[PDB]
Design a protein around this ligand. Sequence first.
Ligand SMILES: Nc1ncnc2c1ncn2[C@@H]1O[C@H](COP(=O)(O)OP(=O)(O)OP(=O)(O)O)[C@@H](O)[C@H]1O
Ligand SMILES: Nc1ncnc2c1ncn2[C@@H]1O[C@H](COP(=O)(O)OP(=O)(O)OP(=O)(O)O)[C@@H](O)[C@H]1O
Ligand SMILES: [Zn+2]
Ligand SMILES: [Zn+2]
Lengths: 184, 96, 48, 362, 145
Amino acid sequence: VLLTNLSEHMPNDTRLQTFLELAESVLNYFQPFLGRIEIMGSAKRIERVYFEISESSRTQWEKPQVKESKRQFIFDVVNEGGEKEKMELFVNFCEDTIFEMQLAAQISESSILTVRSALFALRYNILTLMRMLSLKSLKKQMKKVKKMTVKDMVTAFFSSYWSIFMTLLHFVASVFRGFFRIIC
Amino acid sequence: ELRDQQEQVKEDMETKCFICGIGNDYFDTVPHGFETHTLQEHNLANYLFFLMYLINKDETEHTGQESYVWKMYQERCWEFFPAGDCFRKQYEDQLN
Amino acid sequence: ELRDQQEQVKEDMETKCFICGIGNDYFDTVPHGFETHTLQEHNLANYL
Amino acid sequence: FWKKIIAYQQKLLNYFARNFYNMRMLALFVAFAINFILLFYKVSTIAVHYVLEESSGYMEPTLRILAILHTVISFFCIIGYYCLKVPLVIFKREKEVARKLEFDGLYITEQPSEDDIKGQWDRLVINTQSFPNNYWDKFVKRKVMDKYGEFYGRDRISELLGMDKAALDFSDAREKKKPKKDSSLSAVLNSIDVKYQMWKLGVVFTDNSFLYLAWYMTMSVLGHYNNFFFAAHLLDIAMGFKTLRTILSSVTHNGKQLVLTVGLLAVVVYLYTVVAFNFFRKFYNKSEDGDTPDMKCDDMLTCYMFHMYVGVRAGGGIGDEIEDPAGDEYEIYRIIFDITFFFFVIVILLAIIQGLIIDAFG
Amino acid sequence: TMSVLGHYNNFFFAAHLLDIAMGFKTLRTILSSVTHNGKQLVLTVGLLAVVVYLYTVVAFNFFRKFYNKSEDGDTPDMKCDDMLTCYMFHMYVGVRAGGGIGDEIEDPAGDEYEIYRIIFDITFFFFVIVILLAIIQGLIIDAFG
Ligand SMILES: Nc1ncnc2c1ncn2[C@@H]1O[C@H](COP(=O)(O)OP(=O)(O)OP(=O)(O)O)[C@@H](O)[C@H]1O
Ligand SMILES: Nc1ncnc2c1ncn2[C@@H]1O[C@H](COP(=O)(O)OP(=O)(O)OP(=O)(O)O)[C@@H](O)[C@H]1O
Ligand SMILES: [Zn+2]
Ligand SMILES: [Zn+2]
């Protein structure tokens, strides 16, 4: 808190900057806990106030119910609200939220199958498709390709994508069967 | 009308700071200045946490600033909230 | 259109003073300055 | 000829990629032509078969030729997609995985969410030699090692990224090196990176647009066995024209609200059906002859289906269909029943649907 | 030309009542409320025609026996034996009907396709009668706005 106050009030002191760099890790540990606000000070001048935000308070604040209440309160104060009563309504909301957060802290006192099936279907079906290339049985086809043939080359080019499409069909069917088994 | 109400709420929330009420452009003269102001300087969550701290902290152990805010909160006077002014405006000359 | 007319009336009434026509922000540089101006300095009831 | 064949394949690939959209429009035009011809089918003699009726007689051969053309053009559309759009999908996925690996440590600092098909499939590609194949940054693996190598282990990160710790420096060391020549069968089959190609095929299969084109393929093929399967291809106008997509987006914009409205209508109708089944069963005789009474609300499910079908489709509510209540001890009760049904179901809920559509437009 | 032809047939003078649109500006405002989204309105009708054609295909394939619009059993009047006839049936008395095609075609009770035809009729009512006409009306209202 001391170093943050000094840094914020003096932003262009190289000595302070180097000192903060030396103090980097400690100032990073307490960053979630250090809370800072600005108030209209007693000396007719805006002042910065530093305090400790507790971990339990922060967790209860970012609980989803408190966020829903915050959104509702903001909607209310923005639609039906006056700048005269805005800060009174905000303090009433703060009091209610603090009470509910403290009560929540008090009371709180101490599919994978589908994904795996789909992925296995992909792996098995793609390996099945690639086996025909990996079998080294394309020797007879290579011999038939040694002599250049337009019909042969267009047939091979189209047959590759036809085989890919058939593999996709088999994969879809396998996924459907697996999902049917899982649900039934 | 419901859609317009939602849009008005979001536009106000994103165009002016909730506490001080200053427009976003003034803070945005510095890049990301509006989000820096609304998330670090003037944060409603930070004010709520300050109220929690003040309530849960003993009267004797209060600092001068804390005692000032406590007295004005007990008497329900809300002038301690920055209204129309901020750190940047107040120290504009020296800070910038 | 009726709803938009009502909203336009309220927005104009709340954003600028009825008599002088100056925007609310200029008066709002002082806290509560707009309501002070429109309720104490420039008040249509006061003119009536 | 090893280079000439590759050149010819390149020319064909480029042609399909360049003419991909024209083929997609031609497919829709052929679909409209086929359906226009199918609009002149009739049923005839009992054995049931569908025969084309026309004065020309040439339309049936025209239909055969058009079906063959549609099937060929659709295959050409799949090829054009795989030539043109698939590289962009691979580039995007291969960039996202690189950014997640480097600036998030999605396979080093932490592990996939155990339900992310994309994540556990992309876990394969990191070990492939042919990684940044499409993405420009060819130094992704080195960047990852420079970031996480010291803290988590350079050797295991090298294993994870499929690079060589003790072989890279040995290569820069002094030894004799031997060149290779690509057109050899062993050389080309070794150059084929089976793992990276498997990952790429998985990504393509998981792509949505490729799946849509495969469905188009299946419908086009099935149209040969039953010609009316070509009618499913008229569902492609939505993705064919942007202007129609605007009108359809006016509906799909509030689709969740529209589904919830139908669910609420179903619940309200079920409550009305419960009331009718408890108190107004004798008004549901939909039989003209008195000999056989046809009771529509003796069974709960039958009464619910009655209310859903001819209670909602009716212009004035269920009271338009069920009998008049005059001169009965429950007359006012059934009057309230019918009026409230008309107001809540026919008037308000349909107004909610229409208002959702209008608000989506706005 | 219309004025001259009115002398041969006096009812040709009725075509001149189509001049009020360009005669009065106030009526032109109401008509512009329609013509503002004319392309969208035409595309909506085309989409309605396509959807009705799909429904007609389904009916012609599976629900042909429900389209007997003949009272006397001696002469059965089959409205969906022919594809074009069934399509015209669906366009005319399927769309003009207040409750969809199920208001006109016969009741499905006690049949093996009962639930299928129930879904058919309910979906027809929802998509054609409810949603698409709502799209037309919403286009008009949005044009006003
Ligand atoms: N005084 C203020 N305090 C907090 N936010 C403010 C303030 N003035 C303006 N804002 C703006 O209000 C926005 C809403 O903040 P917030 O992130 O809490 O809302 P959200 O988008 O509804 O999500 P969530 O509440 O889940 O985080 C902030 O992004 C911020 O730019
Ligand atoms: N010259 C002006 N005189 C009065 N009010 C003004 C003037 N310029 C702006 N206003 C604004 O008009 C608002 C409307 O005032 P007023 O309170 O009379 O209206 P209201 O909310 O409709 O209720 P009511 O008339 O019952 O008090 C005031 O709150 C004020 O901020
Ligand atoms: Zn502020
Ligand atoms: Zn004034």
